Amino acid sequence: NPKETKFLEEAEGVEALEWAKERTSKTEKALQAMQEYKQIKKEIETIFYDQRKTPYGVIRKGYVYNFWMDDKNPQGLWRRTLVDNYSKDKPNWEVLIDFDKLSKKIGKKVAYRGVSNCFQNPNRYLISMSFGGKDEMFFREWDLEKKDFVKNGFEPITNSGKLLEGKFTYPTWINKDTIIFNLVLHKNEITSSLYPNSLYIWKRGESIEKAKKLFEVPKEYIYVSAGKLLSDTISSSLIFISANKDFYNYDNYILDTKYKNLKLQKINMPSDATLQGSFKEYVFWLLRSDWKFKSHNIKAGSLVALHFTDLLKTESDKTSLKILFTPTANEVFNFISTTKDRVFLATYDNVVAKVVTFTLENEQWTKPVVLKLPYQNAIFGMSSYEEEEEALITIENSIVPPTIYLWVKTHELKIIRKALYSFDSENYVLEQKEATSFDGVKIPYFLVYKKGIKFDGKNPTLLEAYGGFQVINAPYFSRIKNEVWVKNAGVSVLANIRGGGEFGPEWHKSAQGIKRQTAFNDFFAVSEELIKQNITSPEYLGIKGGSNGGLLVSVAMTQRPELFGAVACEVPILDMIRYKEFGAGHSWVTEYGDPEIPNDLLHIKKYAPLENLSLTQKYPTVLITDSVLDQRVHPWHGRIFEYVLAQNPNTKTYFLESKDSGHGSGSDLKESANYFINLYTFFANALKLKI
Numbered sequence: 001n002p003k004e005t006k007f008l009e010e011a012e013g014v015e016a017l018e019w020a021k022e023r024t025s026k027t028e029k030a031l032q033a034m035q036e037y038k039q040i041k042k043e044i045e046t047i048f049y050d051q052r053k054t055p056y057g058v059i060r061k062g063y064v065y066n067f068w069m070d071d072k073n074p075q076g077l078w079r080r081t082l083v084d085n086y087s088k089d090k091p092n093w094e095v096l097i098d099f100d101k102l103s104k105k106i107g108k109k110v111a112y113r114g115v116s117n118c119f120q121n122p123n124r125y126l127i128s129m130s131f132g133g134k135d136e137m138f139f140r141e142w143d144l145e146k147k148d149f150v151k152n153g154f155e156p157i158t159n160s161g162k163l164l165e166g167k168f169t170y171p172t173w174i175n176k177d178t179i180i181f182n183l184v185l186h187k188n189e190i191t192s193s194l195y196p197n198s199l200y201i202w203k204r205g206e207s208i209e210k211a212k213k214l215f216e217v218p219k220e221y222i223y224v225s226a227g228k229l230l231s232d233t234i235s236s237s238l239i240f241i242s243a244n245k246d247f248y249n250y251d252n253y254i255l256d257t258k259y260k261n262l263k264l265q266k267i268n269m270p271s272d273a274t275l276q277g278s279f280k281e282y283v284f285w286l287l288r289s290d291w292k293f294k295s296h297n298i299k300a301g302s303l304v305a306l307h308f309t310d311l312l313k314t315e316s317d318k319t320s321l322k323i324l325f326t327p328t329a330n331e332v333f334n335f336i337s338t339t340k341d342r343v344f345l346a347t348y349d350n351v352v353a354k355v356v357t358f359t360l361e362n363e364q365w366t367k368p369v370v371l372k373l374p375y376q377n378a379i380f381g382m383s384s385y386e387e388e389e390e391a392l393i394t395i396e397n398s399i400v401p402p403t404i405y406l407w408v409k410t411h412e413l414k415i416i417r418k419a420l421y422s423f424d425s426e427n428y429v430l431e432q433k434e435a436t437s438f439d440g441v442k443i444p445y446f447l448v449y450k451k452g453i454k455f456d457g458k459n460p461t462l463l464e465a466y467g468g469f470q471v472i473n474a475p476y477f478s479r480i481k482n483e484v485w486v487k488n489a490g491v492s493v494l495a496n497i498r499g500g501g502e503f504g505p506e507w508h509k510s511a512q513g514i515k516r517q518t519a520f521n522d523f524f525a526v527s528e529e530l531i532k533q534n535i536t537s538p539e540y541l542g543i544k545g546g547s548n549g550g551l552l553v554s555v556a557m558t559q560r561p562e563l564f565g566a567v568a569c570e571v572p573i574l575d576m577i578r579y580k581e582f583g584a585g586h587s588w589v590t591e592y593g594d595p596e597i598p599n600d601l602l603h604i605k606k607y608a609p610l611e612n613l614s615l616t617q618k619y620p621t622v623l624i625t626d627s628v629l630d631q632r633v634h635p636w637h638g639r640i641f642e643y644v645l646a647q648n649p650n651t652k653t654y655f656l657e658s659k660d661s662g663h664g665s666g667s668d669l670k671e672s673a674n675y676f677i678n679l680y681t682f683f684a685n686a687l688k689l690k691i
C-alpha cells in the first residue's frame with residue numbers, strides 16, 4: 001500500500017534518512033569494488049582539482065571577478081584581478097571572500113549564490129548565500145574597502161538574531177540605504193509552490209520588523225520577484241516587479257521609487273512575453289505567442305523593443321515598438337547582453353550560435369553588424385554590463401575548449417585566455433545529425449566520438465536529453481565527458497527533443513502537457529537511429545537525464561526497456577500523479593497537466609513510470625539519485641522509484657541520496673567530484689568502457 005511508502009514522504013527525520021543512508025552505503029561500496037572505480041576516480045579528481053581549470057569571469061571597474069573552487073577550497077573563493085593580469089597564465093588573484101572559512105566559522109556548508117553591487121556606493125555588495133544546496137537563501141552586506149561583512153548591515157535577521165530564509169530570495173538595491181526583496185517575514189508569506197509571495201522595502205538602520213510590505217501575490221501564483229528595469233546608469237529607481245501566475249504567464253509592473261509616494265503601474269504587454277534586457281531607456285521583450293499588434297501579426301519567438309514609457313500605454317498609444325528579430329524556420333532567440341554602447345543579440349540557427357551587435361543613433365536602431373564566430377558548431381556566451389565598455393565573451397564547441405575573448409572599446413574581439421589544459425580536438429569528431437520521429441519531424445542530435453572507432457554496434461554510448469520548459473539544450477564543451485568518456489572511446493550523444501526550445505516556443509508546446517509522449521518518442525527515434533547506424537546496440541547504450549530529464553529517462557526505460565543497457569535517473573521528478581504534493585510541484589501544472597483533472601490524469605497515467613512497472617520485467621540497470629535538501633522536486637521521487645524497483649528481482653538498481661546537494665550534483669566541489677566518480681564508474685562498468 002501507500003501506507004508502506006509513507007515514511008519516505010518526509011525529507012528529513014528518521015526512517016527515511018536511515019533507509020536512504022543504508023542503500024547509499026551499499027551502493028557506494030558496490031561502485032568502489034568495480035574494477036573501473038580507481039581509474040575513473042583518478043580521472044575525475046585530476047579534472048575537478050586541476051589548477052589549470054579556466055577561471056571564467058566578469059569585468060567591473062578595471063577588475064575581473066571570478067569564483068574558484070578546488071580541493072583546498074571546495075566551497076570556494078570569490079576573487080578578483082586587474083584586467084591587465086587576466087591575460088597571464090597565472091594571474092595574481094586578490095581573495096575577497098573565502099566560503100570555506102565562512103563555513104568553518106558557522107559550522108555548516110555556506111554556498112556562494114551570487115552578488116549585487118550598489119550603484120550609489122560601488123564598494124557595497126549584497127552577497128547571496130544558502131546553506132548547502134537549498135533553494136532557500138539569504139544574503140549579507142559586504143564592503144570592498146574593508147574586505148569584510150558590514151557590521152549591522154543588510155542581512156535578513158529578526159530582532160532576536162534569527163535568520164530568515166526564502167526560496168530564491170534575492171535583494172535589489174533602491175539606493176545606498178534601501179533595498180527591496182522577496183522576504184518571507186511571516187511563515188505564511190509563501191505561495192502554493194512555496195516561493196515567497198511578498199515584496200518588502202527595507203531602510204538602513206531599521207529592524208526588519210519595520211520593513212514595509214509593498215506587494216503580495218495570491219497563493220495560487222508561483223512567485224513574485226523584483227529587479228531593475230533599466231541599467232542603474234540610466235535609472236536606479238525604476239523597479240520591474242514580476243508576478244509569475246502559472247509558470248508562463250505573468251502580471252508585471254513598474255514600481256517607480258523616486259517620488260514622494262511610491263507608484264505602482266501595471267505593464268500592458270502580452271501575458272507570456274518576457275523581459276530580456278534594456279539599452280538606454282528602451283526594453284527588449286521576447287514573445288512566446290503570436291501578438292496581433294495594430295496592423296501586424298508579430299510571430300511567436302520574435303524580439304521587440306520599445307521605450308519603457310510605452311510599457312504602460314494601450315496598444316493605441318504605443319508609438320515606439322520595433323521588431324528586432326523575426327525568426328526564420330530554424331532560428332531561435334537566445335539572449336540580449338548590453339555594453340555601454342552596444343547591444344549583443346545572440347541567437348541559434350539550427351542550434352548553431354549566431355551573434356550581431358547594434359546600437360541607437362538618433363533614437364533609431366542601427367543596422368546590425370555580424371560578429372563572426374571562429375568555431376564550427378559555435379556556442380556563444382558572455383558577461384557584460386551597460387556600465388562597462390568592455391566585456392568577456394566565450395566561444396566553444398563540443399570538442400574545442402572555450403576561448404575567452406575581451407571585447408575592446410574599438411568594437412572587436414581580442415583573445416584574452418585560452419584553456420591551459422590539454423585536449424586534442426583533432427582526435428575527435430563532432431557531427432550534427434537528424435533523426436526522423438514518429439510523425440515525420442526531424443530531431444537534431446549531436447554525436448561526438450574518438451577518431452578510429454568502428455561502427456560495429458559495440459561502442460559504449462551515453463545519450464542525454466532534457467526536453468521540457470522551452471529549454472535550449474545546446475552542445476557545450478564538457479571536459480568531464482570528453483576526457484573521461486570520449487577519450488576512452490565512448491560515444492557521446494545529445495538529442496534536441498521536443499519539449500525543449502531549440503526551435504522556439506512551438507518546439508516546446510509540441511510536447512507540453514498531455515503531449516509529453518511526443519518528447520519521449522523523439523528520444524526513441526534518436527536511440528533507434530544510433531542502433532540502426534551501428535554506432536551502438538542496446539547492451540552498450542546508456543541514457544542519462546536529471547530533473548525533468550529524470551522523468552524522460554524513467555519513462556524511456558519503462559516503455560522501451562529493450563533499447564537500453566543502463567540508465568542514470570538524477571534528482572528526478574517522476575511521481576506524476578502526486579507531484580503537486582512535493583517541493584515546488586504546483587509550479588509545473590502547466591508543463592505536465594493537472595493529475596486531478598480526469599483527462600490530464602488519463603494521459604499522464606499512460607507514461608507515468610510508477611504506473612507502468614511490472615515485477616517480472618527486466619529493466620536496464622539504473623542509478624537513481626536524490627537529495628535530502630532538494631527543495632525543487634523533493635527526494636520522494638527518487639526514493640519511491642528505488643523502493644518499488646528494489647522489489648523487482650530482475651532489475652539491478654544503484655541509489656545515492658545526498659545529505660546536502662539539493663537539486664544538483666553536490667553543493668561543494670568535493671561532493672560533486674564524488675557524485676561524478678560514482679556516476680561514471682556506474683556507466684563505465686555497465687557499458688564496458690575500456691578504461
Ligand SMILES: [Cl-]
Binds near residue numbers: 058065066115
Ligand atoms: Cl562577481
Ligand SMILES: [Cl-]
Binds near residue numbers: 150
Ligand atoms: Cl553603513
